């Protein structure tokens, strides 16, 4: 509290200091229980690799793997990867995948993506713009000719992962199936698709336990989140896998192994406040956890949440410090009590169809009303504030145009208005008046 409010003494009050959160006890991974491994054997030791102007492809599906494991291969020479955050290979499950395979000159292994100095990609092996993958390659002798060929030109780039089947300039370098820059390089590329869907081809993780009713972090195929995995009282449509609130945030998930419809309760937040007298008056503090139930947190429960270190009391008083939901607290014979507040003293009025009371006496009640009437007449220059009026900065501040002028003017408006407020208040007498001796 002292650290928050920046003072070696803090006054009597309630102060928010933080938000308590129930911590996720687990981090969870689940998907349908996959039953196969990625079919690299259909491509990475295939007896024929195609001429890249008509590159080969096969699907990869129903798989769990570390995608770096192809670095363990004896036959492959290299295993390069594309630039969009490449460590993400082993994160959330892939939903459709391919192995794409062909022959090139060995210098062309760098050309297996568009925007390079490439002869291979834009006229033969064109990737879609954010498609994900890696290039794995070797001289052809590591598996199995001048009949291996690549295309030099087209009038514009061809379609993404498509072949323009037609009856056309082609070339081959020093190619034999027993032969880097002019060797025939056998390639396989792994191509991973972008579609949001349940699992098909996952990282090296597995479906862990469906840990219900704990606050947890989770993933379901790729539906990441954090919350209490409470079971639902709701029915999905048969094809629906998860659901969203009136707030549009994810309200629910089906277990990606089962019709277990889970409806999430938030991992409980609770606005942390300290209740204290002046810190000079006590170092005893009472701690409020706004909206929580007294659970994973003297202790007491309120409609405003759980409360700790205050001691519960039945007697009602004027609200020395407020807590909310009618609860208030004070430091007394000592410790911090907490109570339902007084609404003032009760008074059963002596009413009847013939009853009256009339004041026999009065108090004159000379009483302060404090009113503010101006700010401090503050003023600022955007240039002196933002730039220190340094020319090299002021040049750039003028490209942001009238923002300077309108802000400096707005505060000038305020500054003129302070003496306006002052005269609207005080200058209601146009003269000045002098009191008698």
């Amino acid at each position: 509290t002292k650290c928050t409010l920046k003072s070696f003494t803090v006054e009597k009050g309630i102060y928010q200091t933080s938000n308590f959160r129930v911590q996720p006890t687990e981090s969870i991974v689940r998907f349908p229980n996959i039953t196969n491994l990625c079919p690299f054997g259909e491509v990475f030791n295939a007896t024929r690799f195609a001429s890249v102007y008509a590159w080969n492809r096969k699907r990869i599906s129903n798989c769990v793997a570390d995608y770096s494991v192809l670095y363990n291969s004896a036959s492959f020479s290299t295993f390069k990867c594309y630039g969009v955050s490449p460590t993400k290979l082993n994160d959330l499950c892939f939903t459709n995948v391919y192995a794409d395979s062909f022959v090139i000159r060995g210098d062309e292994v760098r050309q297996i993506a568009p925007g390079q100095t490439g002869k291979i990609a834009d006229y033969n092996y064109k990737l879609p713009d954010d498609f994900t993958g890696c290039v794995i390659a070797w001289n052809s002798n590591n598996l199995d000719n001048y009949n291996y060929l690549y295309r030099l030109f087209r009038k514009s780039n061809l379609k993404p992962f498509e072949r323009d089947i037609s009856t056309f300039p082609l070339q081959s370098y020093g190619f034999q199936p027993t032969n880097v820059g002019y060797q025939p390089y056998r390639v396989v590329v792994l191509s991973f698709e972008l579609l949001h869907a349940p699992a098909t081809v996952c990282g090296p993780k597995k479906s862990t336990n469906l840990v219900k009713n704990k606050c947890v972090n989770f993933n379901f195929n790729g539906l990441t989140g954090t919350g209490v995995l409470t079971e639902s009282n709701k029915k999905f449509l048969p094809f629906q896998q998860f659901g969203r609130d009136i707030a549009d945030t994810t309200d629910a998930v089906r277990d990606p192994q089962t019709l277990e419809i889970l409806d999430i309760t938030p991992c409980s937040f609770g606005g942390v406040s300290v209740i204290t007298p002046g810190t000079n008056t006590s170092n005893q503090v009472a701690v409020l956890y706004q909206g929580v139930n007294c659970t994973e947190v003297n202790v007491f429960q309120t409609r405003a949440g759980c409360l700790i270190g205050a001691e519960h009391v039945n007697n009602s008083y004027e609200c020395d410090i407020p807590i909310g939901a009618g609860i208030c607290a004070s430091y007394q014979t000592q410790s911090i009590i907490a109570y339902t507040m007084s609404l003032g003293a009760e008074n059963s009025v002596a009413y009847s169809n013939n009853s009256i009371a009339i004041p026999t006496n009065f108090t004159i009640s000379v009483t302060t009303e404090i009113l503010p009437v101006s700010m401090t007449k503050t003023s600022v220059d955007c240039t002196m504030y933002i730039c220190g009026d340094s020319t090299e900065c002021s040049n750039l501040l003028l490209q942001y145009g009238s923002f300077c002028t309108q802000l400096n003017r707005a505060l000038t408006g305020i500054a003129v208005e302070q003496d306006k407020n002052t005269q609207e208040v005080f200058a209601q007498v146009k003269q000045i008046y002098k009191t008698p001796p």
Binding site: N354, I358, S390, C393, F403, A415, E417
Partner: protein
């Protein structure tokens, strides 16, 4: 002093002290009249007599307590000096406005030291470190930060200035109606029926010393909405009927002073039968 600035008021601290002295001098020596136009001088003992009538307590009550009221007033003034001599937190709003100004400016200064994804928040570093080829990018982030912070700060200042201006209009209004006047409007001068108030200045603010009348001791009586005297009903001209338990009186609504009910303090209003709870009495005729 760091490119931030404070302008003086036109009306400096002691000018305000003269201005409030003029208001207060008018308030003491001429009552409400100096608001309307001419500050027509009026003895202060005639002024509180008018303020009494403005709470329906008739002015004879003032003079029949004259010095005793003065003792309560002076005592309450003394208790205000005591209250303020102890209670720094009596000035909660003004100290809070000053604190919010200070917090806003100190936040604005802390935001000078905020980086906004620049390599530094001391602008001079970038100017000392980089060509405009990159410094324009770094300086653009820092500008964007300081500028968003200004737009933000200025918005807080403007919204806060709208509260201050509402408060200032309210203050000006109380100075019009509760100082240069008497507010008949209950609780517009705080608790009690209102008589008069006095201005006192404070740093960037004002205090009103509201001299409200508050009723205190009371007595317990029987009452009736009307009386019969001739099978004619009779009613009070002002105030209300009461009995202590043996005799009926008319008394004023805000202070127990009994009078014999008479033709001099009542009006006839036809036959009794229309009224629920009308009672018999004898009404006198002077």
């Amino acid at each position: 002093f760091n490119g931030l600035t404070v302008l003086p008021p036109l009306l400096t601290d002691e000018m305000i002290a003269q201005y409030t002295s003029a208001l207060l001098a008018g308030t003491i020596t001429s009552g409400w009249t100096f608001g309307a136009g001419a500050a027509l001088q009026i003895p202060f003992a005639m002024q509180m007599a008018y303020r009494f009538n403005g709470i329906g307590v008739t002015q004879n009550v003032l003079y029949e307590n004259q010095k005793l009221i003065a003792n309560q007033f002076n005592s309450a003034i003394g208790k205000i000096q005591d209250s303020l001599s102890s209670t720094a937190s009596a000035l909660g709003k003004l100290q809070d406005v000053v604190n919010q100004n200070a917090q806003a400016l100190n936040t604005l200064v802390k935001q000078l030291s905020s980086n906004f994804g620049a390599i530094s928040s001391v602008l001079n570093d970038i100017l000392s470190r980089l060509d405009k080829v990159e410094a324009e990018v770094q300086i653009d982030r820092l500008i964007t930060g300081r500028l968003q912070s200004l737009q933000t700060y200025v918005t807080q200042q403007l919204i806060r200035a709208a509260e201050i201006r509402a408060s200032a209009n309210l203050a000006a209004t109380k100075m019009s109606e509760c100082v240069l006047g008497q507010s008949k409007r209950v609780d517009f001068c705080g608790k009690g029926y209102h008589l008069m108030s006095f201005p006192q200045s404070a740093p960037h603010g004002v205090v009103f010393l509201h001299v409200t009348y508050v009723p205190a001791q009371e007595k317990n009586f029987t009452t009736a909405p009307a009386i019969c005297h001739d099978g004619k009903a009779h009613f009070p001209r002002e105030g209300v009927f009461v009995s202590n338990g043996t005799h009926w009186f008319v008394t004023q609504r805000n202070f127990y002073e009994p009078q014999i009910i008479t033709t001099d303090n009542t009006f006839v209003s036809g036959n009794c039968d229309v009224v629920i709870g009308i009672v018999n009495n004898t009404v006198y005729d002077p």
